[PDB]
Structure 1
Amino acid sequence: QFAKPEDAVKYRQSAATLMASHFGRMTPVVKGQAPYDAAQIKANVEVLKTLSALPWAAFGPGTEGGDARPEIWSDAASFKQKQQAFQDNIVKLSAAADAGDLDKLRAAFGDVGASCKACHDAYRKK
């Protein structure tokens, strides 16, 4: 869907920006600094679910640019491992949210965050 590689870069960066907001805005809730409204979090995690599937299609071959390492391309099976583990942790977060279980939400939130960071540490330029 991208006329030039730059358009893929702008897409994936925008998708990432939205995931960071929908993930990070839950920080006060999982820390207990903001109230836990199970319906609010269920709805927010549904948005994050949708967003979480979007970046990966915007790293097609030859879309080197942005802060994307060429190893995304030179080490591709491993990159797919990191995005599928991340998406699998998003499924677990959805399950915790859908269950209305705050302790499980805390734990699942942390697993997601660790997956974000593991991919960045390997595949995102400093």
Structure 2
Amino acid sequence: QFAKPEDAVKYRQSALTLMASHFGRMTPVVKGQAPYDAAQIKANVEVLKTLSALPWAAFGPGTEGGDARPEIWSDAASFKQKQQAFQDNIVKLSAAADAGDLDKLRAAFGDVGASCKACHDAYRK
């Protein structure tokens, strides 16, 4: 699916846009601004779970481009910990949503958001 590096960039940017839309739309619920519908949030977090695993395979060898910093590949072990932190946080978010626990969902959501920002600050231009 990624014949040229531009194809990997296009795919990962699309995946990250979708992941961001499914994460960000839950902000009002975790802030108490909109009612918590546990079944709807559980379904949305399943979509996010699915999406959250997709970008990383499109940052393979020779896929420099987009707004991705070169240190993703020169500091691969460190990038892998930023990715793992995020994926571990998605597991926590799923656990909270599957249990229908709003207080745990809020904590997990803030952990996910902090991991998005940590990777942005180190590896996104």
In structure 2, distance between residues paired with 1:54 and 1:39: 24
Q: State the match for 1:59 in structure 2.
A: 59
In structure 1, distance between residues paired with 2:109 and 2:18: 16
1:44 paired with 2:34, answer no
In structure 2, distance between residues paired with 1:57 and 1:73: 13
Stretches of structure 1 lacking an aligned partner (at least 5 in a row):
none
In structure 1, distance between residues paired with 2:86 and 2:31: 22
1:29 paired with 2:6, answer no
In structure 2, distance between residues paired with 1:62 and 1:72: 11
In structure 2, distance between residues paired with 1:109 and 1:42: 13
User: What is the TM-score with the length of structure 2 in the denominator?
Assistant: 0.98
In structure 1, distance between residues paired with 2:108 and 2:60: 29
RMSD, aligned CA:
0.6
Stretches of structure 2 lacking an aligned partner (at least 5 in a row):
none
Percent identity reads 99
Q: Which of structure 1's runs of 4+ aligned residues deviate more than 3 A?
A: none
What are the superposed Cα offsets for residues 49-80 of structure 1, whole Å, 9 maximum, x if unpaired? 00000000000111000000000000001111
Q: CA offset at residue 38 of structure 1?
A: 0.3
